[PDB]
Design an enzyme around this catalytic site. Structure first.
Site, short mmCIF file in Angstrom:
data_model
loop_
_atom_site.label_atom_id
_atom_site.label_comp_id
_atom_site.label_asym_id
_atom_site.label_seq_id
_atom_site.Cartn_x
_atom_site.Cartn_y
_atom_site.Cartn_z
N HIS A 99 32.70 42.07 38.33
CA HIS A 99 33.89 41.29 38.44
C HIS A 99 32.90 40.41 40.16
O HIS A 99 33.71 39.90 40.71
CB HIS A 99 34.53 42.12 39.70
CG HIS A 99 34.38 42.59 41.29
ND1 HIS A 99 33.86 44.57 41.29
CD2 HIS A 99 33.65 42.54 42.67
CE1 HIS A 99 33.43 45.09 42.63
NE2 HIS A 99 34.20 43.51 43.10
N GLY A 135 32.61 43.55 50.63
CA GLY A 135 30.58 43.43 50.68
C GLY A 135 29.99 44.42 50.23
O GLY A 135 29.25 43.91 50.29
N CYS A 185 30.77 46.15 47.21
CA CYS A 185 30.44 46.65 46.06
C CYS A 185 29.19 46.13 45.63
O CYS A 185 27.87 45.62 46.27
CB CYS A 185 31.27 45.06 45.56
SG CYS A 185 32.93 46.08 46.13
C1 LIG Z 1 34.16 44.55 46.59
O1 LIG Z 1 34.45 44.24 45.51
C2 LIG Z 1 33.21 43.86 47.62
O2 LIG Z 1 32.83 44.36 48.53
N1 LIG Z 1 33.83 42.57 47.19
C3 LIG Z 1 32.30 41.13 48.01
C4 LIG Z 1 33.71 41.12 49.26
C5 LIG Z 1 35.27 41.74 48.86
C6 LIG Z 1 35.87 40.94 50.32
C7 LIG Z 1 35.40 40.27 50.83
C8 LIG Z 1 33.68 39.15 50.86
C9 LIG Z 1 33.19 40.05 49.85
C10 LIG Z 1 35.20 45.39 47.58
C11 LIG Z 1 35.21 46.96 47.92
C12 LIG Z 1 35.95 47.19 48.68
C13 LIG Z 1 36.22 46.41 50.30
C14 LIG Z 1 37.70 47.10 50.73
N2 LIG Z 1 36.55 48.39 50.26
C15 LIG Z 1 36.27 48.29 49.17
O3 LIG Z 1 36.05 49.68 48.81
N3 LIG Z 1 35.77 45.52 45.93
C16 LIG Z 1 37.43 45.24 45.97
O4 LIG Z 1 38.20 44.21 46.25
C17 LIG Z 1 37.97 45.52 44.78
C18 LIG Z 1 37.81 44.47 43.44
C19 LIG Z 1 38.30 44.89 42.62
C20 LIG Z 1 37.79 46.10 41.30
C21 LIG Z 1 37.95 44.79 40.80
N4 LIG Z 1 39.79 46.00 45.06
C22 LIG Z 1 39.93 44.45 44.69
C23 LIG Z 1 41.82 44.18 44.66
C24 LIG Z 1 42.22 44.78 45.85
C25 LIG Z 1 41.64 45.97 45.85
N5 LIG Z 1 41.80 47.57 46.73
C26 LIG Z 1 43.29 47.63 47.89
O5 LIG Z 1 44.06 46.66 47.71
O6 LIG Z 1 43.50 48.89 49.16
C27 LIG Z 1 44.19 49.19 49.55
C28 LIG Z 1 44.10 50.04 50.19
C29 LIG Z 1 45.46 48.99 48.73
C30 LIG Z 1 43.62 47.56 50.54
C31 LIG Z 1 40.17 46.07 45.64
O7 LIG Z 1 39.61 47.67 46.53
#
Ligand SMILES: *[C@](O)(C(=O)NCc1ccccc1)[C@H](C[C@@H]1CCNC1=O)NC(=O)[C@H](CC1CC1)n1cccc(NC(=O)OC(C)(C)C)c1=O
Ligand SMILES: *[C@](O)(C(=O)NCc1ccccc1)[C@H](C[C@@H]1CCNC1=O)NC(=O)[C@H](CC1CC1)n1cccc(NC(=O)OC(C)(C)C)c1=O
EC number: 3.4.19.12
Lengths: 303, 303
Positions: A41, A141, A143
């Site tokens: 992703h 961040g 991930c």
């Molecule tokens: C992961 O992608 C990440 O760390 N990405 C880099 C990044 C993201 C945002 C800004 C700068 C850089 C994150 C890790 C997440 C973030 C919050 N806590 C974590 O463990 N993963 C996601 O954001 C994940 C990506 C999806 C799998 C492909 N994602 C996407 C959309 C929604 C959610 N979660 C969500 O909506 O949770 C609630 C509690 C409903 C807010 C999600 O984790």
């Protein structure tokens, strides 16, 4: 003596951590030999229903910025491994430890090295829950941060972080890119199923309490495997098996308390509570220590 | 989101850990530049009332076996630094990080890298208790394991392990060899004094719970610093100061909940208990997270 939630020393993993950027998206990668592993992703941009096959066909090697400290890594190949990306790079990580990719079972523990921009922030222990979530500590961040066990000099990588579910619990993959649990790397309605208490772990931790001189919950009673499981089910506890009884053997021997005698203590704590008392500094029954964890920490096994 | 007892990544410390043997006594040393630090009691043999000055005058450089993995280190000088030994060796540790020796205050936290025979077993977080003990996890051979904080790239060493007290709590020194608390590196009648709860930490952790969406204990009430401290004292809680109120500022701002409003929640949890509920997965009030720890983990600061 004493009993703490103890993580594996993280140095061997810290030397593998890199930063991976596509477009404006930055997350963490794991650099072993001449491959960098990260969540696929990283290649998403807009993603209710993306096609990753399409997205990856449209990428080029030069679209992937990989940074190991400063030293930029030149990507010379890419491929999708289920929900993980394998970024072939021109240089083998000189700090590559002995390692293997192992999938764990619900109930097993591992260390997490929480990372941001390829930089290690911290290390903690957690368990794979019966519902294939983990109760982690993860922000924007994180991930690509990995979960691992160490045996002798060998890092067993078991988890790569992908997402947070509505209840504030975490889901991810093994290092072959296969999700733990019925989760997908898309924004959907997906939620954790009902979780249960890991019974065998609670019993391991009661053995730890005894080895540490916390004995107040012990009783003269024994119970049957079946009459125990009758009470456990009632309290959302996993069934206990003869295999579980056999795994608790070494701790039974060390304390001379039979497993089914300890189950009598557990049944009584479940029916009557702790009556404002604590076990190993906890006011609730702890279930994120495996029988191995207790033996490892109550015997002083090093790595 | 999520909130975990998080240790600092240990790699920088793992590369400093060595084994030190005198006679049949083996324990851990810390190798920085061309010096190895360990507990002076490595030179004891029989020790109700030893004279260490005498014991050290009677040692020679060649009596100290120092092992960094295999590579034996040649000792070319020795001296006593309070309750620590400084073993001058012929080779500077190439893995020496940026480091400094800092003494911490009761209430402050640090990571412990528990080691056996110079080999890292595990990493956990603890606090310096108000009675200058730590609730560690330490067995025969853990002496010389160190406690540390990391800021940017700089390791602040704050603790070296020496002993276990009758209640199963731990005592040690700073890296200048000065004991935390009224303890001595002899077998005596010595026992931990009465311990108190670190109030400012409990408040930091309630802020963490709020940042993580655990809000059930919040109320519309506020209290005075004095009427709060009147209740706290009753429950063996440290007095809370205007300085503590000022340190909780950033978390007050992030949550928009005034410190003295949170003190009203804490007073009510102290008088009425939790009524079978939990805060951040705990059934008791947690006091081993500093205000800094909560900001660090709820903001994702890396090292
Ligand atoms: C992961 O992608 C990440 O760390 N990405 C880099 C990044 C993201 C945002 C800004 C700068 C850089 C994150 C890790 C997440 C973030 C919050 N806590 C974590 O463990 N993963 C996601 O954001 C994940 C990506 C999806 C799998 C492909 N994602 C996407 C959309 C929604 C959610 N979660 C969500 O909506 O949770 C609630 C509690 C409903 C807010 C999600 O984790
Ligand atoms: C430390 O010396 C150590 O690890 N030494 C190396 C070693 C010891 C024994 C066998 C092989 C190798 C230990 C660390 C201790 C051990 C148990 N848990 C710990 O944290 N420190 C001591 O043994 C210490 C040395 C004294 C300061 C100079 N010491 C000595 C004598 C008694 C005690 N404790 C004690 O009696 O505690 C009770 C609970 C009463 C058993 C002690 O810590």
């Amino acid at each position: 003596s004493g009993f703490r939630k103890m993580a594996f020393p993280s140095g061997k993993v810290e030397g593998c951590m890199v930063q991976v950027t596509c477009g404006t998206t930055t997350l963490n990668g794991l650099w072993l030999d001449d491959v960098v592993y990260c969540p696929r992703h990283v290649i998403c941009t807009s993603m209710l229903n993306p096609n990753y096959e399409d997205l990856l066909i449209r990428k080029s090697n030069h679209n992937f910025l990989v940074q190991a400290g400063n030293v930029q890594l030149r990507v010379i190949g890419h491929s999708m491994q289920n929900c993980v990306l394998k970024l072939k790079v021109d240089t083998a990580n000189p700090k590559t430890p002995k390692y293997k990719f192992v999938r764990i079972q619900p109930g097993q523990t591992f260390s997490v090295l929480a990372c941001y921009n390829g930089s290690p922030s911290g290390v903690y222990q957690c368990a794979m829950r019966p519902n294939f979530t983990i109760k982690g500590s993860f922000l924007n961040g994180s991930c690509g941060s990995v979960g691992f066990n160490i045996d002798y000099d060998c890092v067993s990588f078991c988890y790569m972080h992908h997402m947070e579910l509505p209840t504030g619990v975490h889901a991810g993959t093994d290092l072959e890119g296969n999700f733990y649990g019925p989760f997908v790397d898309r924004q959907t309605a997906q939620a954790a199923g009902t979780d249960t208490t890991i019974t065998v772990n609670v019993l391991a931790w009661l053995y730890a309490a005894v080895i540490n001189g916390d004995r107040w919950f012990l009783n003269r009673f024994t119970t049957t495997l079946n009459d125990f499981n009758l009470v456990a089910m009632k309290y959302n506890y996993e069934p206990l098996t003869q295999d579980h009884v056999d795994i608790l053997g070494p701790l039974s021997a060390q304390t001379g308390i039979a497993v089914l005698d300890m189950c009598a203590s557990l049944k009584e704590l479940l029916q009557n509570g702790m009556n404002g008392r604590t076990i190993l500094g906890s006011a609730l029954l702890e279930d994120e220590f495996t029988p191995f964890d207790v033996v490892r920490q109550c015997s002083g096994v090093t790595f």
